[PDB]
Every structure is written in structure tokens, then in C-alpha cells.
Amino acid sequence: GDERFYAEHLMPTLQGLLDPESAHRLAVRFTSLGLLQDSDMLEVRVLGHKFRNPVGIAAGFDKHGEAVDGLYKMGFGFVEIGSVTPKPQEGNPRPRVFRLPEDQAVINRYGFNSHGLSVVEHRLRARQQKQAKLTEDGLPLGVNLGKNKTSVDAAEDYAEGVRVLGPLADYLVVNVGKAELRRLLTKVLQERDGLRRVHRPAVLVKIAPDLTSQDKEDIASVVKELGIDGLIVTNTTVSRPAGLQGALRSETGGLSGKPLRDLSTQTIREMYALTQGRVPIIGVGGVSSGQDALEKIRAGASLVQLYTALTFWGPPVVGKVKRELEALLKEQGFGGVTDAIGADHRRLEA
Ligand SMILES: Cc1cc2nc3c(=O)[nH]c(=O)nc-3n(C[C@H](O)[C@H](O)[C@H](O)COP(=O)(O)O)c2cc1C
Numbered sequence: 433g434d435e436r437f438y439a440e441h442l443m444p445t446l447q448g449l450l451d452p453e454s455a456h457r458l459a460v461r462f463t464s465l466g467l468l469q470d471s472d473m474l475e476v477r478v479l480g481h482k483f484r485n486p487v488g489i490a491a492g493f494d495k496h497g498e499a500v501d502g503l504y505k506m507g508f509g510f511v512e513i514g515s516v517t518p519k520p521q522e523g524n525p526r527p528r529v530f531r532l533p534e535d536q537a538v539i540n541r542y543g544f545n546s547h548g549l550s551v552v553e554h555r556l557r558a559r560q561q562k563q564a565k566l567t568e569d570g571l572p573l574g575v576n577l578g579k580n581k582t583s584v585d586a587a588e589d590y591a592e593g594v595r596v597l598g599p600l601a602d603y604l605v606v607n608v609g610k611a612e613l614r615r616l617l618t619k620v621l622q623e624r625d626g627l628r629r630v631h632r633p634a635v636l637v638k639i640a641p642d643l644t645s646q647d648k649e650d651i652a653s654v655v656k657e658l659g660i661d662g663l664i665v666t667n668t669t670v671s672r673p674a675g676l677q678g679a680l681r682s683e684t685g686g687l688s689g690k691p692l693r694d695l696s697t698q699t700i701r702e703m704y705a706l707t708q709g710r711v712p713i714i715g716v717g718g719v720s721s722g723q724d725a726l727e728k729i730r731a732g733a734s735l736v737q738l739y740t741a742l743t744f745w746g747p748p749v750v751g752k753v754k755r756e757l758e759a760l761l762k763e764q765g766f767g768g769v770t771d772a773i774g775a776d777h778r779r780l781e782a
């Protein structure tokens with residue numbers, strides 16, 4: 433009911449008042465304080481868990497696990513925190529976040545600023561009973577694991593994240609030659625298998641859209657060989673699509689938001705084909721409407737995430753994507769999200 437107020441007045445006012453990193457910090461703190469029903473059609477069972485709805489908040493908004501409960505209150509069907517590095521680290525120098533308002537886009541080069549595993553673990557331990565309730569009610573928690581800039585043993589950094597935060601997570605994410613990738617992911621999976629849980633977390637690989645065809649075939653091959661549980665497609669892009677209008681489009685960093693929509697959907701289609709539909713995909717990049725979510729589901733995604741759209745449309749975007757997706761599924765005769773997954777590949781086969 434508040435869509436137009438946030439879209440035309442509140443969010444533009446906040447963006448005019450604050451630089452984007454300051455607004456980001458305010459948004460996390462405000463969400464952490466809290467303040468204010470999903471159709472059965474939107475339920476997805478995947479990654480060994482129930483998802484009450486398929487619209488998650490992507491990594492990088494709540495990097496340090498400070499606002500999880502508020503994000504569920506906002507309506508997200510799942511929350512991914514991180515990236516979290518083993519030791520605290522500052523990230524890149526400021527300024528490091530740039531708004532492209534004409535393009536409904538952001539460029540960032542945060543550089544994995546992180547409070548570190550211990551601080552984040554302590555925050556999640558404080559709410560671990562609450563999360564157990566939320567997970568069993570269909571609201572899972574994901575943790576994106578990073579590595580420290582100065583680490584010479586990347587696999588050791590990811591393994592430490594599994595040891596510290598694996599007991600608290602429903603899924604874990606590692607952002608990504610082929611033999612090196614195999615060795616690293618083998619270590620992560622062995623550490624995951626070593627946890628003493630009834631519900632050990634799924635392990636996912638998150639990829640950028642900036643990969644060669646050989647890179648994508650190599651990743652698909654290793655993911656299937658090792659039994660990785662899913663893919664997150666995609667991270668931000670270092671590319672700059674034609675026609676960007678924002679004055680800051682030349683800043684170095686990853687571009688997110690509406691300009692990433694096509695590249696991410698194309699990459700979802702390709703990875704779904706290269707894994708023969710065997711590997712669940714979380715589709716990410718430029719989702720700001722139910723139509724965007726449906727396009728990624730038809731391309732092969734089982735779940736979607738959004739981030740940049742929250743910065744332009746505000747909290748109302750979560751209910752908007754969910755109710756629009758539901759309506760589009762009903763309009764087009766799908767029984768639920770699950771029936772639409774990969775529908776675009778069935779069209780092409782026909
Ligand atoms: C400011 C900002 C910070 C981000 N930080 C992370 C991060 O720490 N780890 C990660 O895996 N992705 C990070 N991302 C990428 C998002 O998770 C997502 O993949 C990307 O922004 C595409 O989604 P969107 O177009 O809906 O924003 C970040 C994105 C933005 C815009």
C-alpha cells in the first residue's frame with residue numbers, strides 16, 4: 433500500500449540526504465530494530481529445506497549478521513548474511529559505494545569489510561533458538577563465507593567459516609584453474625560433512641557473470657563431480673552494459689541492479705543447461721518485480737534473491753515481488769513456483 437510513497441518520496445529523499453554507504457549503515461541499524469500471509473503456491477522445497485516463499489535478501493546487505501530478524505519481518509523467505517571473513521578486516525578505502533540513479537543501479541567495491549567470524553558467531557548464537565523456530569517454519573538462514581585479503585591459504589579460510597558458522601546455518605556459500613577449484617571445494621565439503629548436526633547445511637557456489645564459456649563448463653563439471661548442493665547466479669558484474677546513463681558509471685567495482693538483469697538471466701539459463709537441471713540455482717541480479725523473478729525461475733532458478741531494488745523501492749519491494757510473482761504464476765496456469773522452474777528450456781526443446 434506504501435509503494436508510491438517510498439518510490440517517489442522517501443527513498444529519493446534518503447538518497448539525496450546520505451552517501452550510499454551511510455544510507456546502507458542506517459538501513460541495517462533501522463532494520464535491526466524491527467518495526468512492522470505467503471500463499472502455498474510460493475513454497476519451494478530445495479537444498480534440503482522448506483522455503484515459505486522464494487524471495488531472499490542477497491548477501492552484502494547484512495554483512496555482519498546484525499539485522500536477520502528484521503529482514504524476516506520485512507517478508508523475505510530466506511536471509512543470506514555475509515560475506516564474513518575469518519579475521520575482522522576493514523575492506524577497501526572510501527568512497528567505495530556509488531549510486532547510478534538513472535540506471536536503477538549501484539557500483540560497489542567494499543572489499544569484504546567484515547566484523548569477522550567470532551563477532552558474527554556470537555550474534556547468531558544469541559538468537560539460535562529463534563532461528564531454529566524460523567527455519568522449521570520455512571524461513572532458512574544462509575551464510576556467505578569470505579576469505580581475508582592477506583590469506584595465502586584460501587581453502588583454510590573457507591574451512592574455518594564452515595567450522596565456526598556451519599552449526600548455525602541452513603546453507604553456506606563460497607564465491608568463485610579447475611583442479612584448484614576442486615581442491616578448495618573438496619576441503620569445504622569435507623569440513624561440512626564433519627559437522628555433528630542432524631541438519632548439516634547445504635553448500636553452494638556463487639559465480640559472477642564475468643566468466644568465459646570454458647570457465648562455466650569447468651564450474652559445472654566440478655559442482656556435479658563433488659556434489660555441491662547448489663549455485664547462486666550471479667554476483668555483480670565488472671562489465672558496463674551499453675547505455676548506462678549514471679554519472680558514476682566509470683567507477684571501478686561490481687555493478688548491480690537493473691543493468692545486470694539480462695546478463696544474470698542468461699547465465700542462469702547456461703548453468704541450468706550445463707548441469708542438466710541437476711543443481712538447484714538461486715537466481716540473483718536486477719530482480720525488482722515479480723516479472724523479473726518469474727523470468728529467472730523460467731530460466732532455471734528455484735529461488736531468487738534481491739538487494740539493489742531495496743535501495744530504490746524500499747521495504748515494500750518484498751511484498752511487491754511476492755504478490756506479483758504469485759499473480760503471474762496464477763495468470764499463466766502454473767500450480768506453483770516449482771512447476772515454472774526451467775519452463776524456458778522446455779519451450780526451447782519443443
Ligand atoms: C553494496 C553491495 C554489497 C554486496 N556485498 C556482497 C557480499 O559481501 N558477498 C556477496 O556474495 N555478494 C555481495 N553483493 C552482491 C549481491 O549479493 C548480489 O549478487 C548482486 O548485488 C546482484 O543482485 P541485485 O542486482 O539484486 O543487487 C553485494 C552487492 C552490493 C550492491
Ligand SMILES: Cc1ccc(-c2ccc(-c3nc4ccc(F)cc4c(C(=O)O)c3C)cc2)c(Cl)n1
Nearest residue numbers: 446447451452455456459463529538742743746
Ligand atoms: C522503513 C524503512 C525505510 C527505508 C529503509 C531503507 C533505507 C535505506 C536503504 C538503502 N540501502 C542501501 C544499501 C546499500 C547501498 F549501496 C545503498 C543503499 C541505499 C542508497 O543510498 O541508495 C539505501 C537508501 C534501504 C532500506 C528501511 Cl531498511 N526501512
Ligand SMILES: O=C(O)c1cc(=O)[nH]c(=O)[nH]1
Nearest residue numbers: 541542543544545668686
Ligand atoms: O564486499 C564486496 O566488495 C563485494 C563482495 C561481493 O561478493 N560482491 C560484491 O559486489 N561486492
